[PDB]
Amino acid sequence: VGQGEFGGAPFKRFLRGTRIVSGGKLKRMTREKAKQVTVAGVPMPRDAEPRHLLVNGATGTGKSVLLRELAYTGLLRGDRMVIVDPNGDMLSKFGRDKDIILNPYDQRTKGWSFFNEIRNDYDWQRYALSVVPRGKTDEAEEWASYGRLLLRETAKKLALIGTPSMRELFHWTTIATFDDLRGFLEGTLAESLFAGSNEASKALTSARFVLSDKLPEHVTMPDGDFSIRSWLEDPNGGNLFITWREDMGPALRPLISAWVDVVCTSILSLPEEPKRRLWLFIDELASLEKLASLADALTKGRKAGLRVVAGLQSTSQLDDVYGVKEAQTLRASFRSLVVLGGSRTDPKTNEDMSLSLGEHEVERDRLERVRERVVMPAEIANLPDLTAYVGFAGNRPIAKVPLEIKQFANRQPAFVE
Amino acid sequence: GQGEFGGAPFKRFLRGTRIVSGGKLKRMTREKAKQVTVAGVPMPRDAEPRHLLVNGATGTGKSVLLRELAYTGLLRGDRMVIVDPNGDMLSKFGRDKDIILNPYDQRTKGWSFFNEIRNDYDWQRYALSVVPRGKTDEAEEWASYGRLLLRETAKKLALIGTPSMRELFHWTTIATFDDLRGFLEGTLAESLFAGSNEASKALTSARFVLSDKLPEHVTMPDGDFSIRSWLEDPNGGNLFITWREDMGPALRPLISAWVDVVCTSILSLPEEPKRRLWLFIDELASLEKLASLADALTKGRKAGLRVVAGLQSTSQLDDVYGVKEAQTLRASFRSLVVLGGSRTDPKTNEDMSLSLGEHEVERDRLERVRERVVMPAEIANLPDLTAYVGFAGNRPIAKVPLEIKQFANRQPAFVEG
Amino acid sequence: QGEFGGAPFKRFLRGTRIVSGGKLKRMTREKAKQVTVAGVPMPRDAEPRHLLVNGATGTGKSVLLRELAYTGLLRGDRMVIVDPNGDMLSKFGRDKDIILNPYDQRTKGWSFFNEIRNDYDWQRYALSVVPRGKTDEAEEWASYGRLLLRETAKKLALIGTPSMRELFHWTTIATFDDLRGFLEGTLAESLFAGSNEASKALTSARFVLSDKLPEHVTMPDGDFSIRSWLEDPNGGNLFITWREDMGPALRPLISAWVDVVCTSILSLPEEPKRRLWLFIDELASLEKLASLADALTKGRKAGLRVVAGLQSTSQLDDVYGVKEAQTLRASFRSLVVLGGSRTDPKTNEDMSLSLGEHEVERDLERVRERVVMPAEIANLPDLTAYVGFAGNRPIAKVPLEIKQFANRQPAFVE
């Protein structure tokens, strides 16, 4: 009782805890009436979709294969999605004519400015958050905030005087002299705030530095009227691919983090639509900045129909980015998890997964109760590629399934220009 | 099951890490194509770009192994870069078409970071290599100011046709605040470094930093060698980064820069499925907090990057990269070699024992037991030239003897300038 | 039994193994001339892998280090001895041997300038003179200090006046401006001027130097060179001594010397026949040394053999920091445990654990247990220690005997 399924010694009777079942057994169990999507070949419980999925695993284990499969099936079902797509891979395979591209250096990119998303006044601070993500440390954040003040008041004015120019915004916030800026600032809320003491000056200095760090890309970005918000609202909008070339990843980190974040806040204003189904594919959560909206999005987007799919390698990554406490909370927001198997050199993360997978209490022969890990950390480290454990959200058993490499023809060039 | 497992033989293996005899393993791993060897064991082709981490105390044979690894890899005709202390590898394997980087060696190439700038984004990219990551939060803040100063200055110098390192150095650490300030007019850094005491303070920080790093970069012989181009040239040969131990502390920042340079550069190389590149970082913990190693270890699969690094105690790398980042770092090496350490370092021994893994077994008193395949004590009592080899993925581990193959000197290790 | 403290067993499976003193003595015995640790002959190959002698006060750390030294001398090995109250000196002092003690008639004249030979040597030793800062912040000032130091000293050297008095004057006495002036032309010229931060940096540096330099200044002058000494074969031995009521005063000086050797040995012409010992009676009593680390890692070629003493884990920890202290201890492959106090269970555990556990089969039931319990360590009688040489060797509990040595020289003079 517990073979081909459980890795440990077969037992006599299951008492309580996590239940592990064979791949097949699971594939039936989860199969439902409606059209569903697949995770490693397993039919995903329709109700698990807006509970978000977290795919953890080492490098080269198949995260791609999986999210790719996941994306395809969701398409065959006609779902819309946003894909943090590195090197436009997803694009070249699934990209369609009516779909959108965000890549400041790609011939096909859309013209965009965060201005293109302001619709109410509260929207100013709202997006200053997407542009200027959260500071890694308290101190860093403090500066970050000053930056958002400067940003929002400046852009607010430029807009008012009919010149919503990123170049202009950049100039003022990082080039104009202190005094000139100060002058420009007269009339806006920031007028006083940034003057009166050394502290005040210091604060302004910090704001400048941050903006000079984030804005660069936002400026050199091709101009247009494209609105991520509007796009979301348009049914026939199509899909969105945020692509970039790997050797520039660090340079775009802030921009992309903005976009991704934009979406995370934007979806929250979308009009009540029970039929909407949107996917957010963030290949590597840890490689983006400490997003400001992600949190709530993973918590209040069920109504909008948001389905997030993110991947990770070591737990230490997201921790260092979001902070220990904040990282915990964030992960905890993904109700469904996939374990792809990691390296032996990282025993701590293998333990985390082993434990996330859970224990079970069993009655075994010689009678004796035993409480034990369903999957040992060892088992996870020793996993061969394209093999993973799938534990869907809620009350469902878990199973070890093989990942198959379906082939997809390239229906578009990954990059242009 | 004796002769391979140190504990009590057992009746049946249930799950977890499995250990096997040296030979047994050597057969299992043996493949059709030409492979390389780790302590005599043929390394599975697929595990090569998953990187190898060799951990072990001093005098245990880290050299002998890396030496073997390198040799075998050359016989197959692979290219490589070697952080080579005291030109050891050089004097044994160096050929005439090979490259040498050592500011104090008659044979070195002429180089400056300028030689690697090809696009605008390349400025910050390399300022990162030049100015490695700071050890503390504060530290890095300073480091960032340094890079700003560095990149804007160097950019201008280049612009006005005088890409001089001596010039750059002058400006950044010699020129008076004002003069420098003047020179920066017109560059992005013009305003950012002026306006409040904070602004001034920031500049002072950058000066200090650059004054610390640049030194060696200047006194470096001039030439036009480009690590980038080198990487792109097939008949390019190999690269040896050598130095005499008494000067290790002095070159740490330059070497770290080169190493890093490689780490970032291979990310821009044109698609070549036939490429095989090795990076030998004799002792990862001795370099600075490299800014690109991470992604290198994660996205260099299709560039064909294969990294081999050595470590002694876990506290070493921890102290350099920080506990969270170090975890992530080590976790990026899929294959591991445990050489055995000191009884004065139980912590590290524990970590290695644990990384090796536990197993669940069934023994005759039946008896289920979960236990460490390799005891911490076993590692501390290992005799030299003896080590556990646990190749990436799903494979058993084995305790193998390392043998001292002799290599004739086919070149002088150092040639005073 | 008689060898293992716990219950005798049926069969040894894996892990650490303990044996009888004599049995071990047999095992470690080699052909060539060897030295001894508590009477046990040390494996020639274990020598450059250093030895850490841990134990409580009065347990016999001296008796041991004393014995080790003697045997090594009988073999003709050279050595440096961080020797407190010149005890080691009075016993083994030779006429051709060197003494470093600013308050001893027989000391040699020394200035750190005496070790500069190339340009990279300036920072190299600023490191030895100005050890590492206990805290991150502390160290930051320390860096400033070394900048000020190296640039100043470098210039003084240039203008042909390598005076420690001048140097001290400039770096802690001259007015800010004057100094600033003197600095014109040197790399430090700009770095210490331009903003309040820049001046703060300077200030910090000043305080540092004013704390370290003192003893260096009041030190008898001469041309002696630790480096040179190291290169000279007929050189003899080096005793770094001092009177205990002045230890704190000299701590930075001594720490400087110790370190200087630590970096120095790294430049010596390779000589497979060289055998040098570094006796740092109490590692934790010095400053956070800047070279010690690499010394314990790259000195096999030079033939460096370090022997240090320690009491509580917390000590070294407090000085080098937890992470650094781990690394540091880990660098000594051979260990001796002398047994400590009941009042320190934490260190006792550390020792117990370092000694290791073993897996055994007994009357079948098999068990995993510590070869030596912390309690065993705590109840150890004096002149009794566990010897666990580096590598794959069993450990043994041996008695340390008090051999007597006649005083062939005065410990202190004048």
Next chain:
Amino acid sequence: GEFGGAPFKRFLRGTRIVSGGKLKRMTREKAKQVTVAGVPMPRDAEPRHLLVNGATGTGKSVLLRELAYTGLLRGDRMVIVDPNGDMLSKFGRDKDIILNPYDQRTKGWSFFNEIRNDYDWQRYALSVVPRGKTDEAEEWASYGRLLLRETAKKLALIGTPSMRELFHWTTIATFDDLRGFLEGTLAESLFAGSNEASKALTSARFVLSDKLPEHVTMPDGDFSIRSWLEDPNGGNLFITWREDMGPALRPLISAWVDVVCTSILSLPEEPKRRLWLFIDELASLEKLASLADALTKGRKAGLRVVAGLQSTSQLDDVYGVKEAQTLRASFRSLVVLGGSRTDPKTNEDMSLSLGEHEVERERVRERVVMPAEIANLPDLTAYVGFAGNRPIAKVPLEIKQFANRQPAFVEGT
């Protein structure tokens, strides 16, 4: 038998406990020894120091009192951090010394009285200016010491070793004046040149203003703790104070305690010397700067320290956890008196310090004394574990009576 847990068939290894009497016999030696709760202390365990830990009212007094008495009967000399002149009123003789700025019988003292060589200046600024609790605190502390030592040095130089003047310059004189006064001294430059320099000075001021007070208001004299130590017929020293002034005197007392700690290190080697340092409550003093080495190098001097502790958290907070551990580790002999059930952490620490044993009944490794056993201890009942390879024992402390041969306090004139 005397073992709290279940009787066993055979002892294998670890801590061994025995009956009071049995121990009393084993420990008994030829020469004259002293007694810890009735048990004669192994002479060789004396310079290894004794740590007596116990909750309030468990008998700490009765013990140190006993210890002290038998020591005097042997003719040993000693120093006693004696709160409210308790020990004094009982053992004080005519030839013994007293240090209490508010007692008619106190001696006249200034730290100047201990300066004999140049290194002696910093040496004692350390005693006067204990170590700072935090890293930042100690930073200030060092500035203070610089100011202190440079100033006092000069006043001494110019022939006016006045504590009143010293106090004036360091906390009263204006910045400039002070600045002026310092010209010529090493501190001349150090404290000027930038805001950082001025900030350092401001800090040094404050520190001094915190420590010096009592040192000033202290009755002047020529007494020298150093000289006292060197003088054989010197007698005994009693550092006493009234409990309601303990916080105010904390710095001065710590100073004295510390002074001794450094000073004994200079004494000429005298194989016959036997000195005791009684610090009733170690955690009550400041972060002593010399205590450490004293507990490690005072064997030659014949120093014997005895300190008392309550909660491990006290000492930790004062000396820092790392440092606290080291310090505690320095006493080889320990006495556990039993504490509150409201402090299980320390109970554990003590239980653990007492140790485990491996016994045969099956083999079992267990604590010789449970944390609970320690919390449920009745008063005047303690465990004794002398330094070295010795068993421990649960022994009863009896209240011997001592006649008052001198008034505890004498606020006079």
